[PDB]
Structure 1
Amino acid sequence: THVLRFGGIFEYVESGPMGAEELAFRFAVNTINRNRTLLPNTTLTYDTQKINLYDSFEASKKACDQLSLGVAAIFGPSHSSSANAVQSICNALGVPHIQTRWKHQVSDNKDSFYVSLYPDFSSLSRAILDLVQFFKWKTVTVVYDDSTGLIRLQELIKAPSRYNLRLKIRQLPADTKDAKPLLKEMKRGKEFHVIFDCSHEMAAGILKQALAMGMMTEYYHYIFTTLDLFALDVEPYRYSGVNMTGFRILNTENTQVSSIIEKWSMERLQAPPKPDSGLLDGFMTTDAALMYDAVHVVSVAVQQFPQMTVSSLQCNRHKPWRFGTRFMSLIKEAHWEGLTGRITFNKTNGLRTDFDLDVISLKEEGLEKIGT
């Protein structure tokens, strides 16, 4: 009648409540319900459960609990261990499974009811590979942190088979934040061009230890992979003369979009985020930005189909959801220029391989856009 119900599975915080991706999902449902102009007949409710992100069975419990309670979509357990579990819950039951962060798609996965609003690393990799040729390099050094990130950079590893690069691949130590044994080698090894593959939490920690090593002269050039380089405290580095270069998807250029981020920080007012870390405060990460888009993309789909009755499904009984294929194809065919530019999926797999990045770089006047 006037109610639809989205699911939700998030990490269980203990110290400091309501973590980062949970706020993005709550702020999105409240926004669409408030601004009545979009979707003007039904009100969205939510059933966010909280698990550990490294338990593929605690995820499978809370997935069937939301299926028994009755939902219309599950917005991702957001980690490669339990994402593959809840995806195959949603395939047998028929319910869509909107992911929000990249995982390893196995090449023979025969599932269909999933979309991935995080940009594919089959397209980010060629965006980096284009950017190591506009700068005309012949010797790079890919540094990653966990072993899954080597699958993230396939097209950059396979690149010296067709171009003139000379790859040298290193790995950060897994346990500590002390990568000074690594950087002493790279300073001595004459490697001035680095393509770091880290999260922005670990990218700030290397960028402080690359300053204490004196490896931040005007001879170096760091390309970061993460789409959160705009949220770095780059003020200790802006005068030195380095050229950090990264991509950026979250459109700050639009006034209608940057109004949301200004309205984001007022609920983020209760956050002293320990400013001795290296992260700017009051900025919304790109992982929370995609969850705010993922609610609106499905909200476009329910607008184009008012015949949804949220039924309750059993797991132990095997029966697909009767509005499955009708509602899933509307999600794969959608457009919504929300926070992160154009959201349009790919009809073959269901991923996102068509997006609009902004190449950002470091200058003395801050961290500025130099291309698209």
Structure 2
Amino acid sequence: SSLRMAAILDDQTVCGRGERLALALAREQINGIIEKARVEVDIFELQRDSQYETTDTMCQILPKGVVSVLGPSSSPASASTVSHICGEKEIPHIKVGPEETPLRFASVSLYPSNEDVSLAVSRILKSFNYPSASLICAKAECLLRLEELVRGFLISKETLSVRMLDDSRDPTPLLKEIRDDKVSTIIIDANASISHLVLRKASELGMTSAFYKYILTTMDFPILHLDGIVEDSSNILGFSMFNTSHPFYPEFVRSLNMSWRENCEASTYPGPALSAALMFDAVHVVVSAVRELNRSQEIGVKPLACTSANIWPHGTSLMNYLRMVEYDGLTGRVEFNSKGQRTNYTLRILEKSRQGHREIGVWYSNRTLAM
């Protein structure tokens, strides 16, 4: 009698990314057609990225009449676990966040695969004749998410060198060594925090000049505001998926802009988070496939459990309809392929400036095209 779906969110509520609010904004819009079954979305908070803790959560979702599971978006381990269970339950899993170390398979992801992210950074260096590369890896996973990139080019001081940042050790000696090897191109890989920090103690070394060129793999670039660290000659590229083509985009940013200093006014509002963006379109994609599956086969959800070895009969069915999806959300064209990755989407390469951002180029899922 209703279209339910769980959403394991690990985001906070006080000055967070605004994911719990992103889902609500989506459900309201869906229930604005009047005329069928409603659309409900259950929220399942997570505390710490732990397999153990997540397993207990799934045994509370199965008993309910769910159709799909969203997130986590910032919980690598807690994400892989949900996929494994969703696989032995035929309950689709809309992954939208981390991705490491890719047997039972049954799930699709909106977040750009580690293949496209590495291929994008590779196409950018292409227009520069592949200068002296020097990625500033922030962690160990930095090698997996950019696997296709590291293997692509030779590893040396003249082609591509990798330097990892030790914890509680900061980006100090690093940039220094880069200057020694007369390296110009630098590709940092980390969250919005370390991305702002690495460039901070960098600009105070002449590393902010037009002589150097940086490439941020972090998708939280449009929200990453650099005030007092950038110049007019600086070169700091980035990535984005926010498609202004969506008329609801302006209204979306409005909700988060006010809600920010309405609950946690202890800081300013950076900008629409990528996490919330994926969550929004996600809910639509689910209800979209179910809408089509409710046209061919009557859809009935029967309570499952961790103890019972039962599966959702309309599992594999909905999985095919979550493959032929065509939704235009706050992230561009939402389409999937065989494996279940997102394709036929654009990847606008933004570049910071004296005030705001400037789309210097765009990367497609087949060819690059800047300027």
What is the TM-score when the length of structure 2 is the normalising length? 0.88
**What secondary structure does 1:152 align onto?**
coil
The 2-side partners of 1:68 and 1:371 are apart by: 48
Instruction: Tell me which amino acid in the other structure corresponds to 2:239.
Output: F
Residue of structure 2 aligned with 1:318, choices 305, 309, 317:
309
Report whether the alignment pairs 1:179 with 2:171: yes
The 2-side partners of 1:334 and 1:265 are apart by: 30
The 1-side partners of 2:10 and 2:292 are apart by: 32
Higher strand share: 2
| Count of aligned residue pairs for this structure pair | 356
Residue of structure 2 aligned with 1:301, choices 289, 293, 301:
289
Identity of aligned residues (%): 28
Residues 18/175 of structure 1: CA separation in 2 closer, same or farther (3 Å cut): closer
Deviating beyond 6 angstroms after TM superposition, the runs of 4 or more aligned structure 1 residues are none
Q: Displacement of 1:289 after TM fit?
A: 0.7
Q: Displacement of 1:96 after TM fit?
A: 0.9
The 2-side partners of 1:238 and 1:215 are apart by: 10
Q: Is the contact made by 1:238 and 1:366 (CA closer than 8 Å) also made in structure 2?
A: no
Report whether the alignment pairs 1:205 with 2:205: no
Q: Is the contact made by 1:5 and 1:47 (CA closer than 8 Å) also made in structure 2?
A: yes
Q: Displacement of 1:362 after TM fit?
A: 3.5
Q: Which position in structure 1 is the counterpart of 2:30?
A: 32
Q: Deviations over 1:145-183 (max 9, x none)?
A: 111121111222122259x9711110112234x322322
Q: Is the contact made by 1:98 and 1:294 (CA closer than 8 Å) also made in structure 2?
A: yes
Q: Which position in structure 1 is the counterpart of 2:114?
A: 121
Residues 59/154 of structure 1: CA separation in 2 closer, same or farther (3 Å cut): same
Residue of structure 1 aligned with 2:62, choices 67, 91, 97:
67
Q: Displacement of 1:250 after TM fit?
A: 1.4
Residue of structure 2 aligned with 1:51, choices 32, 46, 50:
46
Instruction: Tell me which amino acid in the other structure corresponds to 1:142.
Output: L
**What secondary structure does 1:168 align onto?**
strand
Q: Displacement of 1:192 after TM fit?
A: 1.9
Write out aligned runs for 1:3-152 (5 A).
Answer: 3-11=2-10, 13=12, 16=14, 20-33=18-31, 35-36=32-33, 41-78=36-73, 79-106=75-102, 110-152=103-145
Instruction: Tell me which amino acid in the other structure corresponds to 1:73.
Output: S
The 1-side partners of 2:71 and 2:196 are apart by: 27
Q: Deviations over 1:343-362 (max 9, x none)?
A: 11112x11224321112224
**What secondary structure does 2:9 align onto?**
strand
Residues 17/145 of structure 1: CA separation in 2 closer, same or farther (3 Å cut): closer
**What CA RMSD, in Å, does the superposition of the two structures yield over aligned residues?**
2.4
Residues 282/209 of structure 1: CA separation in 2 closer, same or farther (3 Å cut): closer
Q: Which position in structure 2 is the counterpart of 1:351?
A: 341
Residues 246/158 of structure 1: CA separation in 2 closer, same or farther (3 Å cut): same
The 1-side partners of 2:134 and 2:68 are apart by: 41
Q: Is the contact made by 1:183 and 1:210 (CA closer than 8 Å) also made in structure 2?
A: yes
Instruction: Tell me which amino acid in the other structure corresponds to 1:288.
Output: A
Residues 18/247 of structure 1: CA separation in 2 closer, same or farther (3 Å cut): closer
| Unaligned ranges ≥5, structure 2 | 363-371
What is the TM-score when the length of structure 1 is the normalising length? 0.88
| Unaligned ranges ≥5, structure 1 | 276-280
The 2-side partners of 1:90 and 1:165 are apart by: 46
Q: Displacement of 1:223 after TM fit?
A: 0.7
Q: Displacement of 1:255 after TM fit?
A: 4.1
Q: Displacement of 1:41 after TM fit?
A: 1.5
Residues 26/17 of structure 1: CA separation in 2 closer, same or farther (3 Å cut): farther
Residue of structure 2 aligned with 1:155, choices 148, 153, 157:
148
